[PDB]
Design a protein around this ligand. Structure first.
Ligand SMILES: COc1ccc(Cl)c(-c2nnc3c(C)nc4ccc(C(=O)NCC(C)C)cc4n23)c1
Ligand SMILES: [Mg+2]
Ligand SMILES: [Zn+2]
Length: 342
């Protein structure tokens, strides 16, 4: 058994200090996708230890090791929505913890729930979106289409199934109230990763940042968790140009594959899913200006120390404008041939 030996080492070898992973591991400039995939489960444990969650919540180490491996094994391998995405999203949550004084805003258990939700938030993603579940009449749509956020409901359900697997419930010593609270938080945070949900609550996020965060307002806690979750989910946009470029390639590979499946079903894909129509520079610039930048602007509004994140998203978007011309074939192609016109 592969997992058996990995677990044995994860449990008995001990947890490496975060600085041994990388000297800049806790910096906004660090790219967690640089970490070898084989080192990521150990890194998850290192972060959990460094954030004091293991000690504070007296988490059972064998259970935690099993849980971490089960979560990793709970991702498939589409180009983008894979374990390295969940890992990098979890890492950014850790960065927010290390850089932004979250304990002035959120309860301990909320910060814990955010991180665990990050690990779990895309579990068993098949590389297709919510619309496709309904159009393809998938099992997931049969279960959840009446509620909406089909994939995100599945991700949450998958997280619960892992918890309900013997030897994996890292919360099973919790008081009844804390257990209920944790699972309720995971529901809210994972369901908040549906961009439709973000767009619905965006006005509320703005009003929150306008009036100023009120740590005594429970709805403010809820809203901030949603924003932070979204900030983690999109955090590839806050690194360098190379990260944005590669993640664009991964996402559109995933998108265009869905589009191919939609065409074969006799449906016409969204433009951004259609490899014959999608003009990537326009599409990325649009996503950055209309989705990613406003999120990190709000984050900056609430946390001044997060200004560098917004400025690098803006910087990355500007670089897309600058390379857009490259999508136009000047002169002859690659191979000196016009055969592709046929
Ligand atoms: C947070 O939940 C998700 C779920 C899935 C994805 Cl792929 C993303 C996500 N993460 N990075 C990206 C980038 C770089 N570009 C994207 C361009 C479009 C869309 C998309 O789904 N647009 C449809 C809607 C806006 C009408 C998502 C994009 N995205 C986030
Ligand atoms: Mg998702
Ligand atoms: Zn995600």
């Amino acid at each position: 058994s592969a997992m058996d030996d990995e677990y044995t080492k994860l449990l008995h070898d001990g947890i490496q200090p975060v600085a041994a992973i990388d000297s800049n591991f806790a910096s906004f400039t660090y790219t967690p996708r640089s970490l070898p995939e084989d080192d990521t489960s150990m890194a998850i444990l290192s972060m959990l230890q460094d954030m004091n969650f293991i000690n504070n919540y007296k988490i059972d180490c064998p259970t935690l090791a099993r849980f971490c491996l089960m979560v990793k094994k709970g991702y498939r391998d589409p180009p983008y929505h894979n374990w390295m995405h969940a890992f990098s999203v979890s890492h950014f949550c850790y960065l927010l913890y290390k850089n932004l004084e979250l304990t002035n805003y959120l309860e301990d258990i909320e910060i814990f729930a955010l991180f665990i939700s990050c690990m779990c938030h895309d579990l068993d993603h098949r590389g297709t979106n919510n619309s496709f579940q309904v159009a393809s009449k998938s099992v997931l749509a049969a279960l959840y289409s009446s509620e909406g956020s089909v994939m995100e409901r599945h991700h949450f359900a998958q997280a619960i199934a892992i918890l309900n697997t013997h030897g994996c419930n890292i919360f099973d010593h919790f008081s009844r109230k804390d257990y209920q609270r944790m699972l309720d938080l995971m529901r809210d945070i994972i369901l908040a990763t549906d961009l439709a949900h973000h767009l619905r609550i965006f006005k509320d996020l703005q009003k929150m940042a306008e009036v100023g965060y009120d740590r005594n307002n429970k709805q403010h806690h809820r809203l901030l968790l949603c924003l932070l979750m979204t900030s983690c989910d999109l955090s590839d946009q806050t690194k360098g140009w190379k990260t944005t470029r590669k993640i664009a390639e991964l996402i559109y590979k995933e998108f265009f594959s869905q589009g191919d499946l939609e065409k074969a079903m006799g449906n016409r894909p969204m433009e951004m899913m259609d490899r014959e129509k999608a003009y990537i520079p326009e599409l990325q610039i649009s996503f950055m200006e209309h989705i990613a930048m406003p999120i990190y602007k709000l984050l900056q509004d609430l946390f001044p120390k997060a200004a560098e994140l917004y400025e690098r998203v803006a910087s990355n978007r500007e670089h897309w404008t600058k390379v857009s011309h490259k999508f136009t074939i000047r002169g002859l192609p690659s191979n000196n041939s016009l055969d592709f016109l046929d």
